[PDB]
Structure formats: C-alpha cells, structure tokens
Symmetry: C2
Subunit: 396 residues, 2 copies
C-alpha cells in the first residue's frame, strides 16, 4: 500500500516489501554514492516544487479551470500535488486509470474518453457508491449511450456524461446536428441513470484557426441551447476543450457559454515537468558509461526500455565520476551526442580524448519527459545533495 | 507471486494475495466481458506447442540455447523454457537477473557489461545461492578492474566471458592488443574473476563473409585459450546469437560444438511466434511449427463515420517496434464465438495514438460500438513491456493464469 516495489529498476537496496514510498529517505540512498541501480529516473524535488508553485501562481485572464491530463505520469502522488495547488480535477483516458487515481485520493476525474465494455463500466460503477467522488465520461453515439444506460441502471448507479462533438476526418465526437440530437435523445431515455453534465471536444485535431473557432463556436451554440432548454443535470454544466495550443482561442470563444452563469469552462492541459514559460525541466535519466570501445564512441547503459523514442533522443546534460564531490554540466560545445538508441544501450559520440571512463555516470535531459514515464514503475525524487527523499510509483 | 489488483488488462481481483497461478479460480472469461480491455492474451495451447517444438528441435540437433528474456521479463515463461530444455536464460541488466533469480531461474547469461556498484551488488547478493550460475561479459581493462575490486571486496567469485567485437560495432574488444590487455587484467584477480569463456554478437555485421570471419576469430581465440588452459570453467562457454545467422554459426562453430572442452550456447529470441531467426533459418534442414501465441484485444469505442472506427488500443498498449496491430478476430458480445477476420473484410489500422487507434472499415461494415477485435502483431515479445500482467487463456477463452512481467 503505497510501498516501494523491491523488484523494480532504478532503485537502491529495498530491505522490505512494506516500505512506504514517502519513507524512502530512511534507506539513505545517494545517487552519487552509487547506492542506486542505473539506469534510473530522477526528479529534482526543488524543480518539481518550482513548477507546481509556478502553475499555482498562474491567474487566468479568463474564467477557466484546469483538469491536467494524468496519462503521462500516472502518479497519484503528483496528481495530489496538482490538486492541492489548484487543479479542478484530473483528466484520464481509461477505467483502469480512473481506479488508480481514485484510490490515490483524486476526488474528481474527467474521463476524456468513451466508457465501453462490461468490466470497464463495472470498474467505474465500483467507485460510484462514494458520494464524495465526482466522475464524468464522454458520449458520442446512441449505441454507446444505450450500453451505458442499460448497465448503470442494472447496477443502480448514476453516471454523468458529457456530449462530445467531433469533426470530419477527426477522432471521436458527433459529426452533425442530427447525430447530436439522437445522442441527446438517447440520454433522456435513461432519466434516473444518465445525467447530462456538459459538452466536450478536442479542438486539436484541426490545424487552422478559422476551423478551430468555427468548431468552438458550434460547441458554444449547442451548450447555450441546452442551458436554455434546461437539459443539463449538473449545476454548473461543464464545457471542456483541450485549451493548450489553442488556449487563447478556446478561452475567447468559450466565454460566450460562461456568460449564462450556468456553465463552467474546464481545460485539459498536458505535462508540468518541462502558463508555461517559467517551467523548469524536472526529470533526468541517469546511466553508466559501460564501454568506450573506440576513441569517439561510448556505449551507455540506457535503451528504449528506459526512454520512450517519442520523447526524443536523450541529451547529455551532466557528467559525474564516482568519488567526486559533484557532477559537472556538459556544454553543447563538447559535442557529446546520442546517435543510436537500442533496446538496452545507447551510442554516444564523443570527441577523441574526451575525459570519460567506464563507470562514469551521465544525466540526460529528454525533450518530452512525461512520455518516458511509462518506462518507469518507480521514479526517484532527490534533494539538491542527490539524496533520495521519496519514490514515485506509476500506474501504467 | 500474486495478481496486481491495480493493473490493466484484468478482471475483478478480489484480494491482494491471489496467486498468479490461481487465476483460474476467479473464472474470468474474455468473451463474457469479465476482463478489462485492452488486454494482452496468450493462448496456452500455442505457448505449449511452441515450447514442445523447440524441445523437439533441441533433441534433433543437440543445440544448447539460452533464449533472450529481456523482451518478456516473465519468469513464469522462463521456467517453462528451462523445464523444456533451455540451458539458461540470457538477460541484459542486473535488475533483470535479480527478477529471473526471484522467479526461479538457476542459470543466467547476462549478455552485457556489469557496471556500477549497486548493479554489481545486486548480482553479488544472488551469488550466495550455490545452485545459481551466473556469467557476465567483459570488454575492457577498466571494466575488469572495477569488477575485480568489487567482487574481491565482498569475498565472492564471478564468471566472465570475453566479448569479441568489430570496428564500428557495439561492445567487445576490437583487436589482439585490446584482447590481451583484457585477458591480463582478468589474471590480476586470480581468486575473484573466473574466465568462463568467449562471447560475441555476430549480427552487428550484415554481409555473410564478414560474419564468418568474425565467427572464425571467436573459434580461434577460444581454441587458443583451451590450449593455454586459461579457462576457469570446464566446459568453457562459446556463445553467439545463432538466430538470424543460425545456419552460418552452426557451420563455423562445428569444431567447438564437437569438442568436450567447450560448449556452444546460442541465444534465440522470441518463442511466441514463427518470426524468430533460429526457426526461419532451420527450414532448409527440416525439409507443424511455431505459431503466433499472443493477440491484443480491444473494444470498438465509436464509429463516428462510415469508414472510420475508433478502437481502445494505443501506444500505451502496443509497442511501435512490435508492428502495427492487424485485425484478426471479431467478437460481438452475446455471440457463441468470435469470427476470423480475413484481409478481404477491408479492416485496417491507420493510426495509433496514446490510448486510441484508428480503424479503416468499408462503409456498412459488420461492426458496432462495444464489439471486441483481437489484433495480431508482428513481433509479439516486443510489446510485453506495455503490460505488467498478461493473460493466458484456454481454447474456450477462459483465463487459466496471469503472467507477471518485470520491467
Ligand atoms: Na508496493
């Protein structure tokens, strides 16, 4: 129960099976003392807290609240920090994810996805006898609504749904007004079970601004009509877009729905580990130099098992020789560059005669940090002296 | 070893101490929608068919195999491999060795350099088990000295294999100077490091005359060390991959395989498909074989346009290196059984996002929200690190066991 996994990678010696993650400090792991198996995933406590407090300081120019997507870390320890620093809820994608977040103390989850399949539905139904828990999922088809309605009725629960709008050539969401009206009608056939709680879209399938505005404006018109018809079962109704790349455009268009006093706008941002200019990169992967077979080629103990290829090639940022007081920063001018990532190894180009030895450590930055998280069941949190203060568990 | 109550791809797990091997008692049936989709599904009868085939193959040709476990990291599967004749399991990292040890593997060839005090300590802890045999690779004086000093300081002994490499390659000594420097360094730790043999990965090379030359060098270095009596293990181990280049390796290692001073150990990959080198290359010699044993099951979530269905399967569930998922079976809840999907149905996955996939279908397809599709993937072993728990089913789609992974 929120205990360190003694068989995971990227850890030091774990002398019991019930050592609380938050008690990791008593194990006295220090990264520089080689207490920890490399490769390891390392969050800097000072930077994580910086990024949290930075986001907390953010005063929006518009009436909008944030439900950051949790799928990139799947770490309820981080979700709780996000919620205590002002997030409205967590956006998740699967029933499995929702259960994980719920048992990690998240009390509001926007499942930005269709809920389908008997076990996925039951996994959500299991959380719905908690009167303090708030849940939403998306609907975009009559069949999907009927499946939800029949199931949740059969287990005597209520389920909040958001009508999802979509676009031609897009992903999910109703494509036109006739579909929209059929989906809305289907919901009224389960009056004691399904509860229309708002409207949702993902505007980022579109590329041009005029298309985005026109899509946002159709969502506003549908929302205002449902307000006027008193067809929402939640007060306020929720209107949600991604609002990342299109943050400004989404806010401008969605204000028109808010002006009813009956709708709250909820946006669904991504990674906090890099609203955004002052965020600091909080995660590095640390690996050993295992072999330097040629004067310009080093082999590193880091592979695709440790670092998502969709995160981008790892970039050497720090160098540390065991026995030294501290690491040193690697300057771009040194030309240390990963030119190959295999399963468990990386190829590092170095200038001939570089001061690098087998057994040295390198800390790597990665461009899209959160995408790497799913390669790590345990992520370390370190203080500025590289002492591990906490272990973060993930639920992938 | 118990079922993780918080994992994906499972049914209702009603306790925290349900043994993985007692999964059948939970009575999960895939077609009854007892299990959360997406799920990774191994077919028991196919896994067993593949193991039995490799067992029969090893008896025909006398080959010693240490199959790669790095791609599945599933000691339940490792144990079956060893029970049906594997010589040991080949692994990549100290963490993996420890997991395999914990899962009852009694011989590991770590086909990698062992570097770093915690990594070394993790291996040292296991060496207190006198029934466990371990090997790792050395390719540098610095690496040999770091191992020697560490294992001497914990009063243990370590078997190492000299790794031969090639210019522009991966690891391994490049030339005779480098080779002799590594061997000499080994001899500086006479009661700690035990030279147990010679290893290479020949498929860094692409042309055949190069591979043969490299293999020939391996045989020559081994023979030389046999004559000088530099090995501290009888027999000494000579190990090549012998998968993608199985037929060439088999020929070149002829004389080492024939002697009793040396045992040849090959390192095949995936036993969950016909697409493994040792099997593809054995066909000439052989003239029902290896079958694909894994499929990923997912729901249809939305059919928003007549030619486009959205599937609850993403890059979180299906590794890019495994290949694009291909629809293979279709099941509508309430029905007796799935149906086979042929290419002529016109279903094809055209996009895989984080948690969703795009399925092209012909307008008017026999498909509905809430149906399940089973997908084939080209390299099934390579998708295991997306799953902490993998289901095993019997022919009636009843879950008979859950397989845990150590990634
Ligand atoms: Na635990």
């Amino acid at each position: 129960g929120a205990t360190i996994d003694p068989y995971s990678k990227g850890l030091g010696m774990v002398p019991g099976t019930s050592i609380q993650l938050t008690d990791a400090a008593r194990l006295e792991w220090n990264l520089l003392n080689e207490d920890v198996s490399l490769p390891a995933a390392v969050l800097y406590a000072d930077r994580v807290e910086h990024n949290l407090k930075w986001m907390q300081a953010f005063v929006a120019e518009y009436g909008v609240k944030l439900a950051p997507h949790g799928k990139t870390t799947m770490a309820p320890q981080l979700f709780r920090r996000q919620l205590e620093t002002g997030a409205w809820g967590i956006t998740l994608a699967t029933a499995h994810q929702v259960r994980a977040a719920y048992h990690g103390g998240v009390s509001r989850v926007l499942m930005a996805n269709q809920l389908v399949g008997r076990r996925n539905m039951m996994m959500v139904a299991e959380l719905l006898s908690d009167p303090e828990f708030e849940f939403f999922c998306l609907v975009d088809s009559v069949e999907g609504v009927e499946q939800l309605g029949e199931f949740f009725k059969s287990v005597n629960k209520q389920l909040q749904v958001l009508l999802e709008l979509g676009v031609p050539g897009g992903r999910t969401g109703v494509r036109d007004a006739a579909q929209r009206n059929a989906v809305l009608e289907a919901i009224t056939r389960y009056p004691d079970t399904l509860k229309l709680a708002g409207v949702e879209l993902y505007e980022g399938v579109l590329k041009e601004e005029h298309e985005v505005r026109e899509f946002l404006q159709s969502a506003v018109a549908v929302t205002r009509e449902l307000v006027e018809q008193e067809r929402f079962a939640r007060a306020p109704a929720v209107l949600s877009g991604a609002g990342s790349a299109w943050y400004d455009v989404v806010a401008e268009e969605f204000v028109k729905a808010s002006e009813t006093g009956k709708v709250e706008v909820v946006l669904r941002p991504g990674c906090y580990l890099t609203m955004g200019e002052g965020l600091l990169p909080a995660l590095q992967l640390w690996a050993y130099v295992q072999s330097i077979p040629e004067p310009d080629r080093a082999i590193i103990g880091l592979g695709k098992r440790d670092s998502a290829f969709d995160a981008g090639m790892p970039e050497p940022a720090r160098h540390y020789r065991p026995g030294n007081e501290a690491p040193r920063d690697i300057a771009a001018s040194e030309g240390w560059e990963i030119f190959g990532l295999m399963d468990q190894h990386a190829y590092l180009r170095i200038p001939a005669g570089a001061d690098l030895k087998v057994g040295d450590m390198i800390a790597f930055d990665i461009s899209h940090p959160c995408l790497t998280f799913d390669k790590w069941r345990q992520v370390l949190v370190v203080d500025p002296a590289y002492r591990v203060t906490e272990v973060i568990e993930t639920f992938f």
